[PDB]
Ligand binder design. Structure first.
Ligand SMILES: *CC[C@H]1/C(=C/c2[nH]c(/C=C3N=C(/C=C4\NC(=O)C(CC)=C4C)C(C)=C\3CCC(=O)O)c(CCC(=O)O)c2C)NC(=O)[C@@H]1C
Ligand SMILES: *[C@H](C)[C@H]1/C(=C/c2[nH]c(/C=C3N=C(/C=C4\NC(=O)C(CC)=C4C)C(C)=C\3CCC(=O)O)c(CCC(=O)O)c2C)NC(=O)[C@@H]1C
Ligand SMILES: C=CC1=C(C)[C@@H](Cc2[nH]c(/C=C3N=C(/C=C4\NC(=O)[C@H](C)[C@H]4CC)C(C)=C\3CCC(=O)O)c(CCC(=O)O)c2C)NC1=O
Ligand SMILES: CCC1=C(C)/C(=C/C2=NC(=C/c3[nH]c(/C=C4/NC(=O)[C@H](C)[C@H]4CC)c(C)c3CCC(=O)O)/C(CCC(=O)O)=C2C)NC1=O
Ligand SMILES: CCC1=C(C)/C(=C/C2=NC(=C\c3[nH]c(/C=C4\NC(=O)[C@H](C)[C@H]4CC)c(C)c3CCC(=O)O)/C(CCC(=O)O)=C2C)NC1=O
Ligand SMILES: CCC1=C(C)/C(=C/C2=NC(=C\c3[nH]c(/C=C4\NC(=O)[C@H](C)[C@H]4CC)c(C)c3CCC(=O)O)/C(CCC(=O)O)=C2C)NC1=O
Ligand SMILES: CCC1=C(C)/C(=C/C2=NC(=C\c3[nH]c(/C=C4\NC(=O)[C@H](C)[C@H]4CC)c(C)c3CCC(=O)O)/C(CCC(=O)O)=C2C)NC1=O
Ligand SMILES: CCC1=C(C)/C(=C/C2=NC(=C\c3[nH]c(/C=C4\NC(=O)[C@H](C)[C@H]4CC)c(C)c3CCC(=O)O)/C(CCC(=O)O)=C2C)NC1=O
Ligand SMILES: CCC1=C(C)/C(=C/C2=NC(=C\c3[nH]c(/C=C4\NC(=O)[C@H](C)[C@H]4CC)c(C)c3CCC(=O)O)/C(CCC(=O)O)=C2C)NC1=O
Ligand SMILES: CCC1=C(C)/C(=C/C2=NC(=C\c3[nH]c(/C=C4\NC(=O)[C@H](C)[C@H]4CC)c(C)c3CCC(=O)O)/C(CCC(=O)O)=C2C)NC1=O
Ligand SMILES: CCC1=C(C)/C(=C/C2=NC(=C\c3[nH]c(/C=C4\NC(=O)[C@H](C)[C@H]4CC)c(C)c3CCC(=O)O)/C(CCC(=O)O)=C2C)NC1=O
Lengths: 172, 160, 98, 146, 54, 92, 162, 161, 161, 160, 161
């Protein structure tokens, strides 16, 4: 597991030189944005169980055959497993937002998630539909200017949007 | 094209085109503005017409996508919708060419031999084109939806 | 390719038209001129027509000039009519032999 | 040349092509067109300018001509018997289609008939690709015209 | 790989044999990608994931 | 396109039978005839039926009837089964 | 055309009189400000395709429904994505016209006169253009009075849409 | 054969693309000139005998080819030769309507040079008769349609040399 | 074949007269209802497969003809059955367009009663199958268009009995 | 192959292959199984060889990726690694053929004219191929990198 | 080859005439515009490597013609294509200087459509590159010389079409 600072340390550890004085200015620009980072995470971790169930409900109206009798997410054993499966993706996306780099997203979550949907028979294209349902709810809640000073945060919600559509192309 | 069939037909007799044959060319080039606009309206609705058309086809024919059907699987259903895109592209060629000869020379000559060899039910490809016709005919006006539907029903008649 | 001349087959299976009349309406058809009339020059069309409606090749130079002039003046149907209406066709093929 | 066999070498004029001659006319007799007669030789043998990667192997030949150490006949010969010429106009061709072409480059005309094309076809059967070039450049019509 | 993502509840050999009674689902439609936008050998769009890891 | 474009004597096209049919005429007769081979005894081809009843287009009846007569055949009956009589326009 | 030059002529011509120093002082203030205005007009022009392609992307990340919904009013096809970037380049081109002329004259006639009849008819939402104009304000990269002259004509456009 | 419309469709279909903006402008270039081509095609069909009759008198009438020893001496060779000029006029008119010289390759030019070499017909005198026939036609149909017809007269001559 | 336009040209030409007032009135009767036939002609061409499938199953599907020994038994018989019904539907559409049933007497009813009697085809059942094909086709084109359409279905059945 | 140049060299002389000329051909086929193993190593490490070779090329020549360089941008940089993928493929051809003719005939003749017409620095493409060589010689044994080093070296010398 | 002056001398010699007013008009027409041609010919020689580099990238650089499998894929085929564009541009300048397209017929267009049909070179894509080369050169040389230069780019594509 790395954070954003660890990928600059461990890169030049393989090159073996000291960290340059123009690279410290890139790390100090990150800690100036370090407190706008912490309320993108606090906005999405607090409405976490309503990002999930409002995105599942939007999925099951577009593709109604996933919940009809003989469908994949039909029973009450498997509706709960489908609802869990978006909670785990939203968990590791917010983990990779607070670290700054995606090295824990594709390690404990995406490392072979595609190959276990071929074994389970789960439609992997429909999990990537319901991740982009959750991307549209989470970047709208990271623009919420209540209890926070007004400023430009467009470069950090575009990084949160990057970890959502990385986990969508890794299941199809 | 309307011009092509008039020139080859008057070559078999070894003569020039008649005023009745030349007026069909004048009457056709006058409608060129309406044909270029109708084809543009369909080309801008590819993902909706193709996606909407294949969505209704799997409710009138649920067996083709179930276990055992021809289009069973994500990659097979992907090539399923690939075929519908071929015939939507051919329909835009016929609307612009002024006749159905592009639809015939590309994808109707030998269509029953192709689909029987691939193991595909030809009756399902004609059901999927009839569903795309309803979607495409709901994006047009009263007169433009009438003629665009005739290009979809022609493809189905030649596909049975 | 799945072509079909359905009205021509039912008329030839029932006996209303002979095989000579079946071959004649297959020569002046649209599938024929689409394949053996359009992609060729008038010189090459006269030679391929002798292979289909007579089963042989042109023999002399005066035989080409006689049928090139008919095709040049009357098109396809004026040529196919002059080959089936000839004495050589009926001599070898009389109304029933392909 | 068939009604006037002695017209060989007599320049036609402005009706024919341009003739390049390694002349060397001056009050000191210095050749000032050594770089133009070399450009004209590549266009006579190959018809075009060869690529910079394949012209590398022939730089040893051009260096000796620009230094005034080769005649046009020994330059035209060293270009035709090269392996880039062989890889272009000899190997990928029918054996009598190469003689008809190679004969048209080194001599400005195609063959007259079968007594001339069969003569080289026998020199190719015995000696090879190089034996055909030397028999055209050492010809009597070559030395009389060029 | 983590072992819960290595060995799931059932495998490919139990799922494929029951496609008549259970596990008959047929798959929904993917997002429609047009065929002429797909990359071929010698296209520089097959290296844009390499360039974003630089 | 039609056989009566003026081609007659002293033209470039060889002298042949000329019909009075319009371009793409659609009149057909119904004929009956017998036509012996009169050449099988030096060619030795197989034997064929010579009693024929068939529909022949208007465009070819002048040439067909003129060919059956040259080759010794005998025409037993002929009727018009398609087309109008003395129609001015509408034979196409 | 609201220019400081033509507002001076129309003030003297309302009462049928010559240009006094009430009017020569008004057009003096155009010329003192024209130095900062004409440097912003070159800077917004030279970085136009960076700003137009950046601000068209700013609407899609803010309103993702405009790339998903079916209809002629949204930018879901390539036709609608080309008519979107055409409009952003219309808003940027009017702003540089106002900095050249000096007043809010070009975008009054060419851009905002009749605009709300168009957005009501063609079902275009004016919040898309406020989001796009607020990208250009935060990313022209200017400073000083060059930035204050540019931000004023951008904020004039935001108040007409709101 | 393929006209200007089908030539645009095949160029797009061979790539798998729909008709984009670059091909739509070529489709508009043909519709704008469609009424001009139908107008010239009707005047050429009515003056065909006088276009051939005046292109022959101007190029090869009292020449050497009409006297004994030359090509086209006898009446069959005079009649067989003006039947060739009636091919080029009629097929140059098809190409002008279709806006594509494709029909001149298949049904006219494909193998026409070898036919004339075996028959012994002079190609230089044939090209001069088509060129004289191009000038007479250009005066009947005007200057705009006249240079369209000359576009497909030169395709026959360059496809014949 | 002669349509409504040609049939009035014929009546005038046999007298040597131009088109008088009574003639121009019949011509307006055709033009005024012309675009209604073109609309009905395309509607039947699109529903041709279903107009025959519902007429056959409703008229002769489980009868004695489809059973062994009966007529229309073998698949060749069955395919020849529904190949005939499409012939009538396709030719009745040609007659409604031209407004004159002359095309039905030349290319459909050309001695069709003798052919059906020799082969042993039940004339009583073919007439009732065409009648069932008239009641489903009338539901599509409406009454105003269904009036002209049914005018020729009865022409085939009347010329067949 | 050596077979191709041995037949073309003997065909032009109008004789059969020589005794020693044949012994070279026999020695080639006896090492053909080993050539397939060396070329198999580079083929499954192709993306890693291009990535590491791509990274270290941009540190020794940062002018090619800076503003004003030819490979400036992410799309122009993608064309960088595309060209590097070509030459890594052509060296695998030369390994199996036991000769440089597959490299020379595909992407060495006209390489100066091609890059000179694109505006691309020919001096830098040789630097990238040299940076791909050390990674390739890093995945091989002592004498296997001595075999692959011949083909990587010929490509650079011809590119200058 | 013959230039504009030679074409006037020969047209008078074929008539047996001294140079009259009509031929003196064509002589001055070349002498007046003669120094405008020497300027365009000097600017094209300097921007030659740029006119080709811009018409290639404009027309056929990122298509499937350069990818594997396309004609002109390898470096030998790439270098051979830009060598063909070098001759067309270089020969259209010879024709503009001489004021007569005779140079193009004898050294460029003779048997050139048979040469490309033998090798498999696409003639359609070759015409596009010359059209792109026509406008890139028309912007450098101006409006007067840019139109006369395009007169000989069209002569090449017409004979190559
Ligand atoms: C709406 C969602 C779609 C769907 C989901 C679905 N998934 C499962 C089962 C599993 N998913 C995983 C993946 C992970 N598990 C993990 O613990 C982690 C983090 C380490 C990941 C990335 C695994 C292992 C399973 C198996 C059991 C589980 O742990 O949850 C199921 C149930 C399968 C069953 O048949 O019981 C469903 C229904 N299916 C759909 O229909 C939707 C498209
Ligand atoms: C892009 C940000 C969003 C978007 C754009 C979109 N706009 C239109 C249509 C029109 N836009 C205008 C605006 C102007 N025309 C002008 O001349 C000027 C001043 C120079 C302005 C500001 C007008 C008049 C139209 C309609 C007429 C036309 O098409 O030209 C469309 C097309 C809508 C339609 O129904 O045709 C689109 C898609 N839409 C989005 O979703 C983007 C977020
Ligand atoms: C552990 C809990 C914890 C938090 C929740 C944050 C909360 C937080 N954010 C900011 C400070 C800030 N917070 C924002 C954030 C936003 N403005 C917006 O318009 C967006 C809606 C939103 C984030 C997406 C900005 C832009 C600033 C800096 C003000 C500025 O520079 O303009 C500050 C003040 C810091 C300072 O004064 O230096 C604090 C305490 N930090 C924490 O330690
Ligand atoms: C021996 C020559 C011969 C054949 C073959 C023949 C076939 C024939 N098959 C029918 C078939 C039919 N065949 C099926 C067969 C089916 N098979 C399946 O595997 C499915 C479960 C089911 C649906 C396809 C059904 C359902 C019908 C009746 C269709 C209907 O009327 O709805 C009918 C319609 C009713 C009738 O029997 O009269 C005929 C005439 N007739 C002949 O003279
Ligand atoms: C332009 C004219 C034209 C057509 C129409 C065409 C069709 C075509 N369809 C194919 C496959 C296919 N076609 C289908 C089609 C279907 N499955 C269903 O359930 C439906 C009933 C049906 C229509 C959507 C399927 C599933 C395959 C893949 C078959 C397989 O992989 O086994 C293939 C083989 C793979 C390929 O090259 O794409 C071709 C060539 N080619 C053409 O040139
Ligand atoms: C490399 C490919 C290639 C071949 C093979 C080739 C053959 C070739 N064979 C020739 C003649 C000949 N070839 C034969 C051959 C035969 N007579 C027989 O009875 C046998 C069946 C047969 C040999 C097995 C004869 C008799 C002649 C002389 C013909 C003549 O003198 O008119 C000639 C004419 C020689 C001349 O006119 O100078 C050539 C060029 N040329 C080529 O480029
Ligand atoms: C050599 C033996 C022989 C003869 C004579 C012959 C005649 C013959 N005359 C015909 C028609 C005709 N014949 C006439 C002739 C006449 N109208 C009048 O008013 C007259 C009194 C008469 C002129 C003397 C007309 C008008 C037709 C066309 C009938 C129609 O089109 O309705 C036709 C129908 C085919 C066609 O017209 O091309 C044949 C076969 N066939 C033969 O094999
Ligand atoms: C051997 C067979 C044969 C014939 C017959 C023949 C005829 C022939 N007649 C010609 C002209 C002509 N022929 C005539 C003839 C006539 N004017 C009248 O009033 C009379 C009715 C008629 C003569 C009795 C005239 C006036 C011309 C010149 C027409 C012109 O220059 O426009 C010409 C064009 C110039 C020339 O003489 O070469 C030819 C080729 N050529 C042949 O090879
Ligand atoms: C559809 C394209 C097409 C063309 C054009 C065509 C021409 C063609 N021209 C022919 C002859 C001929 N063509 C001419 C023509 C001419 N004599 C001259 O002096 C003039 C230069 C020229 C008239 C412009 C002559 C005189 C003959 C007869 C040759 C002979 O009888 O020896 C022949 C031999 C048949 C015959 O002798 O009647 C053919 C097949 N075939 C085709 O398929
Ligand atoms: C274009 C105008 C036209 C018509 C109408 C036409 C009819 C026609 N119907 C035929 C046979 C037939 N027709 C039927 C029809 C039927 N069976 C029934 O039970 C129903 C009553 C009826 C449905 C309409 C059957 C079963 C045969 C086959 C008879 C046999 O093979 O012995 C045949 C014999 C050729 C063949 O076997 O295909 C002809 C020629 N031909 C024509 O050219
Ligand atoms: C198999 C033999 C073979 C090769 C090698 C080949 C190269 C080739 N390299 C290209 C471009 C290119 N190559 C580069 C490369 C570089 N920029 C730099 O600064 C560096 C020095 C260098 C990377 C190491 C760039 C930037 C382009 C695109 C230039 C442009 O689009 O203007 C292009 C044009 C577009 C395309 O890729 O199709 C071709 C055809 N083609 C072939 O058939």
């Amino acid at each position: 597991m790395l954070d954003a600072f660890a990928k600059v340390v461990a890169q030049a550890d393989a090159r073996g030189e000291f960290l340059s004085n123009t690279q410290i200015d890139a790390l100090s620009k990150m800690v100036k944005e370090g407190n706008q980072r912490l309320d993108i995470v606090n906005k999405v971790t607090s409405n976490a169980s309503a990002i999930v169930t409002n995105s599942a409900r939007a999925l099951f109206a577009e593709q109604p055959q996933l919940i009809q009798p003989g469908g994949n997410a039909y029973t009450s054993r498997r509706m709960a497993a489908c609802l869990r499966d978006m909670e785990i993706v939203l968990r590791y996306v917010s983990y990779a937002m607070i670290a700054g780099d995606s090295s824990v997203l594709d390690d404990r979550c995406l490392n072979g998630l595609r190959e276990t949907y071929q074994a389970l028979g789960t439609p992997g294209s429909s999990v990537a539909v319901a991740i982009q349902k959750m991307k549209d709810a989470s970047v709208a809640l990271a623009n919420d200017t209540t209890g926070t000073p007004i400023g430009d945060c467009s470069s950090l919600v575009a990084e949160l949007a990057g970890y959502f559509d990385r986990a969508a192309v890794s299941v199809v | 094209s309307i011009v092509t069939k008039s020139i080859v037909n008057a070559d078999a007799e070894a003569r020039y085109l008649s005023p009745g044959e030349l007026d069909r060319i004048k009457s056709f080039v006058l409608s060129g503005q309406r044909r270029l606009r109708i084809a543009q309206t369909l080309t801008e609705n590819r993902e909706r017409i193709v996606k909407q058309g294949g969505q209704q086809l799997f409710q009138r024919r649920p067996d083709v996508v179930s276990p055992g059907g021809n289009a069973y699987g994500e990659e097979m259903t992907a090539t399923c919708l690939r075929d519908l895109d071929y015939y939507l592209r051919l329909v835009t060629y016929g609307i612009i060419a002024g006749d159905v000869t592009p639809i015939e020379e590309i994808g109707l000559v030998g269509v029953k031999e192709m689909y029987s060899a691939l193991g595909t039910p030809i009756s399902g490809v004609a059901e999927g084109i009839r569903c795309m016709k309803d979607v495409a005919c709901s994006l047009l006006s009263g007169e433009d939806a009438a003629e665009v539907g005739f290009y979809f029903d022609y493809t189905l008649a030649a596909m049975q | 390719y799945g072509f079909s001349f359905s009205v021509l087959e039912s008329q030839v299976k029932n006996g209303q038209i002979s095989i000579k009349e079946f071959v004649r309406s297959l020569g002046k058809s649209s599938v024929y001129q689409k394949q053996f009339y359009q992609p060729y020059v008038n010189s090459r069309v006269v030679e391929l027509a002798f292979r289909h409606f007579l089963g042989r090749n042109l023999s002399s130079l005066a035989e080409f000039q006689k049928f090139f002039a008919i095709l040049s003046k009357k098109g396809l149907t004026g040529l196919v009519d002059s080959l089936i209406n000839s004495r050589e066709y009926s001599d070898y093929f009389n109304e029933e032999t392909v | 040349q068939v009604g006037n066999p002695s017209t060989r070498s007599v320049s036609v004029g402005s009706l024919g092509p341009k003739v390049f001659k390694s002349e060397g006319i001056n009050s000191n007799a210095q050749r000032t067109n050594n770089e133009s007669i070399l450009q004209a030789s590549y266009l006579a043998v190959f018809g075009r300018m060869i690529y910079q990667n394949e012209r590398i192997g022939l730089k040893g030949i051009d260096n000796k001509f620009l230094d005034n150490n080769l005649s046009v006949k020994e330059l035209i010969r060293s270009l035709a018997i090269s392996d880039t010429f062989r890889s272009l106009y000899w190997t990928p061709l029918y054996v009598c289609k190469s003689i008809e072409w190679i004969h048209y480059r080194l001599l400005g005309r195609p063959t007259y008939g079968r007594q001339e094309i069969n003569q080289y076809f026998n020199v190719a059967y015995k000696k090879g690709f190089v034996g055909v070039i030397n028999s055209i450049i050492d010809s009597v019509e070559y030395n009389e015209c060029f | 790989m983590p072992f819960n993502l290595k060995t799931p509840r059932y495998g490919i050999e139990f799922r494929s044999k029951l496609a008549a009674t259970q596990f008959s689902w047929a798959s929904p439609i993917r997002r429609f990608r047009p065929q002429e936008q797909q990359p071929k050998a010698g296209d520089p769009a097959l290296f844009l994931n390499m360039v974003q890891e630089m | 396109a039609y056989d009566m474009d003026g081609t007659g004597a002293g033209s470039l096209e060889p002298r042949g039978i000329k019909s009075s049919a319009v371009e793409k005429d659609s009149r057909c007769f119904k004929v009956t005839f017998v036509l012996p081979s009169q050449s099988r005894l030096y060619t030795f081809r197989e034997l064929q039926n010579v009693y024929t009843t068939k529909m022949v287009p208007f465009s070819s009846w002048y040439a067909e009837q003129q060919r059956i007569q040259k080759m010794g055949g005998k025409i037993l009956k002929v009727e018009l089964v398609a087309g109008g009589q003395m129609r001015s326009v509408g034979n196409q | 055309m609201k220019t400081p030059i033509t507002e001076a002529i129309a003030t003297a011509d309302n009462q049928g009189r010559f240009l006094s120093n009430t009017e020569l002082q008004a057009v003096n203030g155009r010329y003192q400000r024209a130095t900062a205005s004409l440097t912003a007009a070159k800077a917004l022009t030279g970085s136009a395709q960076r700003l137009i392609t950046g601000a068209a992307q700013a609407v899609y990340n803010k309103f993702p429904y405009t790339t998903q919904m079916p209809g002629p009013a949204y930018a879901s096809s390539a036709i609608g994505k080309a008519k979107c970037a055409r409009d952003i380049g219309y808003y940027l081109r009017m702003v540089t016209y106002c900095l050249v002329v000096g007043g809010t004259g070009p975008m009054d006639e060419y851009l905002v006169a009749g605009l709300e009849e168009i957005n009501r008819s063609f079902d275009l939402s004016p919040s898309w253009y406020i989001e796009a104009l607020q990208y250009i304000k935060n990313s022209h990269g200017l400073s000083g009075q060059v930035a204050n002259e540019a931000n004023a004509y951008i904020d004039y456009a935001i108040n007409t849409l709101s | 054969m393929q006209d200007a419309i089908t030539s645009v469709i095949n160029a797009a279909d061979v790539q798998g693309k729909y008709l984009d903006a670059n091909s739509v402008e070529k489709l508009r270039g043909y519709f704008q000139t469609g009424e001009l081509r139908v107008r010239a095609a009707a005047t050429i069909a009515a003056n065909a005998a006088t276009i051939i009759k005046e292109a022959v008198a101007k190029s090869l009438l009292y020449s050497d080819i009409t006297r004994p020893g030359g090509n086209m001496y006898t009446t069959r060779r005079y009649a067989a030769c003006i039947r060739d000029l009636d091919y080029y006029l009629r097929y140059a008119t098809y190409g002008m309507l279709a806006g594509d010289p494709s029909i001149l390759d298949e049904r006219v030019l494909n193998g026409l040079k070898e036919t004339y070499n075996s028959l012994g017909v002079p190609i230089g005198a044939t090209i001069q008769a088509i060129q004289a026939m191009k000038e007479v036609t250009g005066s009947l149909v005007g200057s705009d349609a006249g240079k369209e017809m000359g576009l497909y007269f030169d395709y026959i001559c360059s496809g014949l040399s």
